[PDB]
Structures are given as structure tokens and as C-alpha cells.
Design a protein around this nucleic acid. Structure first.
Lengths: 211, 127, 157, 134
RNA sequence: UGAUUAAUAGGGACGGUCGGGGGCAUCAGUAUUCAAUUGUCAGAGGUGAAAUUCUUGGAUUUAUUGAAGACUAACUACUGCGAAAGCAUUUGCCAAGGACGUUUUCAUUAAUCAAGAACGACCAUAAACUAUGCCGACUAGGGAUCGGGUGGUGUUUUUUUAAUGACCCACUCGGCACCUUACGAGAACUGGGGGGAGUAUGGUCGCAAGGCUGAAACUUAAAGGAA
């Protein structure tokens, strides 16, 4: 209700009407008769759904400009136990928000870790970067490894040569960590400890043994 | 726990918390003798036995004067001689508080046990 | 963990982002981010060997305005984490007495005046409970009562 | 662990709106037991149907003692019987479908609670020794 | 035929129920992958750039259709359930569990854990990684929330087919949590030396410098480094 006049001005410079319906709790954007841009209503759609997803307004009307886009990475369906899930998501946010703010700086994006999903705004190179970082953080590889690789790749992109060589000989994300392959006997574990549904009886007490 | 022990635990930590009334259920004759002798020496005030037919409740109104009650979980035997080494061993000072004994003439504090010259087993203390 | 450039950029990503590719490496950091990055690094290196009473000196701020700064800053912290927790937003974890570091902290430079936590409450928290005076030794005192060991019963009676 | 009981009242007399006789109540008890109800069901149908609060209060004694005086004593006591029939219902379901490991764990719990008051009823000897639980 | 209560200990019955508890069966969803039939035509993947790869035997895209395996998005919460590991489509069946309600029944049947018992020749895979708080026998609470119950009397409801509601307010019992409060001795899959940050070295153990190679017994080629 306080930021609404600024949404109305920011859309009326693009010729889009918009209403705020508090009796339902909705926001609609509508193409008017004077709307000469066809694809501006999709950016206004992103704008109202960002204001619903609780980004701020000055960070939200950076979506109405062409080099920017939304994304909502989905992380609810990566792992089974809630302890491991919340520890990997807090690993994504980081100690005192350091990992999240460093990723925001390196990818030029704006990230909100919320619930079991990770929203992001930003340029498209940054959006692909943050998507692979967030999904790799929900799998086991730490996000500071990806942040180190982002700093390495930034410094390799700001040199004129080395622009057509593969950078895998630079990156440390290649670690050669596949060093588990067991050689245990499976002496019982092939087919032993066969299942019954009925348990055996109990060992009775002393006074039960005397009665 | 026991059944005298938790009555004395309620009457301890309710007073340490600083309340003026404790409700303690279940009640028994051993609790009534124990509270009876400690109100004789003046560590609680009036106390009432509300009879419901299940086990009885006690409401103790208690002022400020107690700082520890309890029971002695091996109820060993004492004699009229060795009450003195026992009160010196488990009470805070020379003439500080009382040791409550289960005697042949009821439940009594140790000074009345030597005053009317009886012995018993130990039950608990109050100081 | 022993990459110094990485952890330095990680823990200085907040005031780089407050006072700004992006420039992060020294030989490229211009004024206020430079002075506070240097001050941050010198305090962090100094805290290992230097005395805790003398490494973090707070600015001499009067009572009625340091209490006012803290009250308004805690109202800002409460609004921030209450709004971000009534949304779904996951925030990084603080300890129990510490102020949460937010954008207004890094921007207003509030820790030099208000500190990281109210160390009076931290002191009277970290003190131990005053535990009366000890009375007896003849037995152990459990919730079932006073266990007097059988050696002690024989020894006394 | 919760606390939901019935509060047995402080009075131990007939409530004096009970205009009936204490003999017709015993005749009703033996009628319901002969037509085949467990003492809990006897007492609840008596409580709701014809307004006897509790038969120990209005009549002489508790209603398993009434059935023992009128020759209707239960073969196995009621608690042990109901846990027997529950344990064999779970064992029927388990022999039916053998991947209900939650039912197997519940069978373990029901069998232990069988054993506990089978032990109690054997050391009081309501039921005789060499009582095995099949 | 010939002694008590009926523990805000415990067990059992019953009543309306509650839940993403479990088992079997069934129903569904759009995705992904493959295939088939068209339509059209030179690209399509993918990357920081490329590449491997598919492609005028027509890839990718579009449309219709069919199958296979996996999963159950949004609703999804500091909420619910389970002894824990864990559990999200509908419907049915099978048993089970919980709290609540009770003027039902049994009458001490109980709590605790060493031991033990249950759960936890073929295609190959990750786990932890910044974290935290003062502990227990312990007092009041506060706002919210989930399940049950009692009362109040307004609106959504509605009526002569059988019931079953939703909301508001008070009370109450029990849960996963959260914010405060008051008061207490809180002692009697294994293998280990003892702080942090440094500083110095005629000891022990190793690495380590030379200096154009050729090229040394030979002052020796060709080719090269260096300037």
C-alpha cells in the first residue's frame, strides 16, 4: 500500500495499468489501449510476482529493463532427511550471509533463499551461474568451491588471450574424488538374515521361571 | 521416587521458590507425623488435610523458616547413645535443626527421643 | 580453508557491497571500502594475541545516545528478521547475545559505537551460578533422599 | 502421556433420584451377562440405559464379583482376553501380508503387554500355572 | 462360599474421531525418455568459449497418438504422523496408534537400564564441511498453532431423505515449537600428550650449489644456448 504509487508510475511510463485488490489480496497488471510494447506485460507479470515473493521494490523494478530476468530454482526435491536438507540450505546462505552475498557480487544477481526454493533476479549469465551453484550446493559439493571457480573464471575472462583454450587445466573443481569402491566379502549380505513376520518369544523372568 | 521424599521435595522447593502455600498429595500418617513435629518446632505453620476418598491432600501454609527437609534412604537403626554422633554428623552445626526418628513411641525428633529415652530408626531431618 | 584470497573476499563481501566486474582485490579498492577492509583485516589479525580488553575499544559515546542507537538498531534488526521470517526467507545464524549484522550495520558503521553485543549482559551471563554453602558430607543427596553409605553407617553407629 | 480418566465421585450412596431396587439391578446384570457381554459392556449399558451410576456403589460389590457370585465368571480375565484377541488379530493380518513391519513391531509391543499381566495374573493365580500364551 | 479405596500410578472396554503412521490393491497428473504418423527445412546440443554427439535416411521445433520407468510440483507451514530410520495423487480393504470424553471395568499389575530380542555370473553410488546452548528433581506465565471436549449466541448454514458443518469468544486436556520468568550441588567404532603465538641453532638426519653442453683418456666436429 505504501509502494503502490511507485509501481503505478514505473508501469505508467511503460503504458501498463495495474490494480491492488486488498479485499482478495491480489495484484493485476493489464495491457491498456496505449500499450505499444508487446512483451512488456510479461515483465510486469514478473514485477507483481516478485512483489508477492517479497523482494523489495527498488530491487524489484530492476526487472522492467531488458537485460534482467527472474528465476526460481527448486531445491525441495534433492535430499531425503530434513537435517541434511536444512544444513545444506544453511550452507548455501553461509556463515553470516557471506556465501550468499559473495555469490550476489560475483554473479551480479540478487538471490533470496526462501523456504525450499531459491529465487534470483539478474542477468542471464549470472542466472545460469547461480542455478548450477544452487543445485550443486544441494548436492554435496560446497558453494565456496564454486565461488572460488567464479573468481578464477572472472580473472581469466578479463585477459585478452586464453579465450579459446579450455579452462579445466586452471580450475580446481576438478579434484579426482572417486576413491570409494569397496572389496568386502558379501559373505552373509548376499542372502542372509532372512525375514520372518513373527518375532520369537521372550526370555521370562526369575519368578516366571519359578511359577 | 518415594512417597515421603517427594512431599518433602515439594515443601522444599516451594519454599525456596518463595510461596506461602503448598499442596502435597498423596498424604499419609507418616507425612502427618513428620509435618506435625516440624510444625511443633516451628518450621511450617498451620496445615490442613483435605480428605478426598482417594489418598488425601495436604495444604501447608509455610512462612519463611525452613531451609532443608528430606529423608534418609537407608533407614538404619540408631540407639539413644549414637543419636549424638548422628545429629553432629548430618546436621549443619551443634544445635541446629533436628533429626526425626521413627521410634517405639511414634515419630519424634532426636532431642525428644533422648528426652523420653527411646531409640528407633532414622527417618529424615529438618533444619 | 587455507586459501587467503577466497576467505578474505568472503568475509569482506559485505562492505565491498556496501561501498562499491566488481573490484575486490587490493591494488584496486578505492577509498571507504579500502579503509574499512584494512581496518577489518588488522582487527582480525590482531585479535589472536592481543588482549580482549584492548583490541575492541568502543568510541566514547554518551549514555543517552548510545542506548538510543542500540534501541533503534535493535528495532531495525527485529523488523528485518521478523519480516524475513514471516516470509520464507532463510537467514544466517547468530549467537544468543550478538547483534545480527545487517546492511545498516555495515553502512552506518554501527559496531564501533555500539559494539557487537552488550558485554555487561554477556559478563553476567557467563558468570557462574552462586551456589549457597555446603553443609554435610555423610551421604549423597538425590531426589529420592539422602543416601548414607553402609560403610558410613558402620563407621558412625 | 495424557490424563483422561473418569472422576469417581466423593459420594458413595445411591443418588436418591435412583428410585429402583438394588435387586432388579443384579437381575439386569445377570441378564446382560447371560446374553453375552463383557463386564465393561455390562457396566456401560447399565450406566446409560437404566440410571445406575456404578454397581459397587448402588449394589453390594463390583460386577465381576457379582458374576462370580451368580456363576458367570470369565474364563480368562477381560484385559488379558482383549489383548489375546488383539494379538491374534494382528497375527492374522501379519500372516496375510508379510511386509507390514509396523505391524510386526506392534505385535512385539502387544506380546510384551500380554506377558506382563499374564505374569501378574499367574502370581496372583487367577489363571493357573502352565498357562502358555499359545 | 466368608474385609477397604479406586492413585491427575498403570491396564483394558467403549464413543465421536485425528494423521503426508504402516501393508495390499486401485485411480490420476503433467513432465522426461523412446517409438509412430504428419508439417517444414539446416541446423540442433552444450559451453565462459569450443568440443564429444544428433543431422537433407530430415536433426531441433510443431501437431496427434501410444508405451516405459521414476516421481507426486504449486497447496508445503518452525505445521501433522511414526520408537527411530522416515512419511505427500484419488478410492477401497486390512489391521494398528494417539489424545480426548466417561458417575465403565481390573486392582498395584508399576518405573529403570548390564545381557538379550526386533527395526535401522549379472547395471553402480557419497558422507561431513561453521556449528552453540548452561545443566535438572525446578516456579509462574504470554502470543500463536494442531487434536479432542464443554459452554456462549451472531453470521455463514438451512427446509420433513440418515447424519456431517465453517467462523467468533471464554474455559479445558494433551502435542511439535517459540518468547520470557524463580530456584536448585550440579562433586563424593580403540591406540593420547598437555596450552597459544613465536624465536634461535658449531647437535643428529636428509635435500640442496657448481657452471655453456657437445667433450673425454681427446683443449675435438656439426648443431644449439648466451650476448
Amino acid at each position: 500500500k505504501t509502494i503502490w504509487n511507485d509501481v503505478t508510475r514505473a508501469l505508467d511510463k511503460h503504458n501498463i495499468a495495474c490494480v491492488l485488490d486488498l479485499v482478495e489480496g491480489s495484484m493485476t497488471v493489464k495491457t491498456t489501449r496505449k500499450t505499444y510494447d508487446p512483451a512488456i506485460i510479461l515483465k510486469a507479470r514478473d514485477l507483481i510476482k516478485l512483489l508477492a515473493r517479497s523482494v523489495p521494490f527498488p530491487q524489484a523494478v530492476k526487472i522492467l529493463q531488458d537485460d534482467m530476468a527472474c528465476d526460481v530454482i527448486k531445491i525441495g526435491n534433492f535430499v531425503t532427511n530434513k537435517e541434511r536438507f536444512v544444513k545444506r540450505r544453511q550452507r548455501l546462505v553461509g556463515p553470516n550471509g557471506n556465501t550468499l552475498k559473495a555469490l550476489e557480487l560475483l554473479t551480479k544477481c540478487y538471490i533470496l533463499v526462501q523456504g525450499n526454493t531459491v529465487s534470483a533476479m539478474g542477468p542471464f549469465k549470472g542466472l545460469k551461474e547461480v542455478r548450477r551453484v544452487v543445485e550443486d550446493c544441494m548436492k554435496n559439493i560446497h558453494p565456496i568451491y564454486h565461488i572460488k571457480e567464479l573468481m578464477i573464471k572472472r580473472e581469466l575472462a578479463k585477459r585478452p588471450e586464453l579465450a579459446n583454450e579450455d579452462w579445466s587445466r586452471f580450475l580446481p573443481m576438478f579434484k579426482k574424488r572417486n576413491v570409494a569402491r569397496k572389496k568386502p566379502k558379501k559373505i552373509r549380505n548376499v542372502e542372509k538374515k532372512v525375514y520372518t513376520p513373527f518375532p520369537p518369544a521372550q526370555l521370562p523372568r526369575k519368578v516366571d521361571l519359578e511359577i | 521416587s518415594s512417597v515421603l521424599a517427594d512431599a518433602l521435595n515439594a515443601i522444599n522447593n516451594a519454599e525456596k521458590t518463595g510461596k506461602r502455600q503448598v499442596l502435597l498429595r498423596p498424604s499419609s500418617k507418616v507425612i502427618i507425623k513428620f509435618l506435625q513435629v516440624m510444625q511443633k518446632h516451628g518450621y511450617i505453620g498451620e496445615f490442613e488435610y483435605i480428605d478426598d476418598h482417594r489418598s488425601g491432600k495436604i495444604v501447608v501454609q509455610l512462612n519463611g523458616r525452613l531451609n532443608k527437609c528430606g529423608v534418609i534412604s537407608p533407614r538404619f537403626n540408631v540407639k539413644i547413645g549414637d543419636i549424638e554422633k548422628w545429629t553432629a554428623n548430618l546436621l549443619p552445626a551443634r544445635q541446629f535443626g533436628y533429626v526425626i526418628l521413627t521410634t517405639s513411641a511414634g515419630i519424634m525428633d532426636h532431642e525428644e527421643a533422648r528426652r523420653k529415652h527411646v531409640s528407633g530408626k532414622i527417618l529424615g531431618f529438618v533444619y | 580453508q587455507n586459501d587467503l584470497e577466497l576467505q578474505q573476499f568472503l568475509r569482506e563481501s559485505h562492505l565491498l557491497s556496501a561501498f562499491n566486474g566488481i573490484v575486490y582485490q587490493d591494488d584496486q579498492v578505492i577509498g571507504k571500502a579500502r579503509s574499512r577492509t584494512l581496518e577489518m583485516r588488522l582487527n582480525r589479525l590482531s585479535r589472536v594475541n592481543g588482549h580482549q580488553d584492548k583490541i575492541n575499544k568502543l568510541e566514547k559515546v554518551p549514555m543517552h545516545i548510545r542506548r538510543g542507537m542500540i534501541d533503534k538498531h535493535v528495532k531495525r534488526i527485529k523488523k528485518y528478521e521478523q519480516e524475513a521470517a514471516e516470509g520464507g526467507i532463510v537467514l544466517s545464524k547468530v549467537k544468543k547475545g550478538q547483534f545480527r549484522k545487517i546492511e545498516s550495520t555495515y553502512k552506518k558503521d554501527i559496531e564501533r559505537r555500539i559494539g557487537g553485543s552488550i558485554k555487561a549482559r554477556d559478563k553476567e551471563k557467563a558468570t557462574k551460578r552462586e551456589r549457597g554453602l555446603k553443609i554435610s558430607s555423610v551421604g549423597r543427596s538425590t531426589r529420592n533422599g539422602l543416601i548414607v553409605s553402609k560403610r558410613d553407617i558402620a563407621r558412625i553407629s | 502421556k495424557g490424563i483422561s480418566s473418569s472422576a469417581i465421585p466423593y459420594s458413595r450412596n445411591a443418588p436418591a433420584w435412583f428410585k429402583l431396587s438394588s435387586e432388579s439391578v443384579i437381575e439386569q446384570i445377570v441378564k446382560y451377562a447371560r446374553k453375552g457381554l463383557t463386564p465393561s459392556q455390562i457396566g456401560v449399558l447399565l450406566r446409560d440405559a437404566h440410571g445406575v451410576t456404578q454397581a459397587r456403589v448402588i449394589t453390594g460389590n463390583k460386577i465381576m464379583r457379582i458374576l462370580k457370585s451368580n456363576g458367570l465368571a470369565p474364563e480368562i480375565p477381560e484385559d488379558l482376553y482383549y489383548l489375546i484377541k488383539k494379538a491374534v488379530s494382528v497375527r492374522k493380518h501379519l500372516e496375510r501380508n508379510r511386509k507390514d513391519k509396523d505391524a510386526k513391531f506392534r505385535l512385539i509391543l502387544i506380546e510384551s503387554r500380554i506377558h506382563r499381566l499374564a505374569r501378574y495374573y499367574r502370581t496372583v493365580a487367577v489363571l493357573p500355572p502352565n498357562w502358555k500364551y499359545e
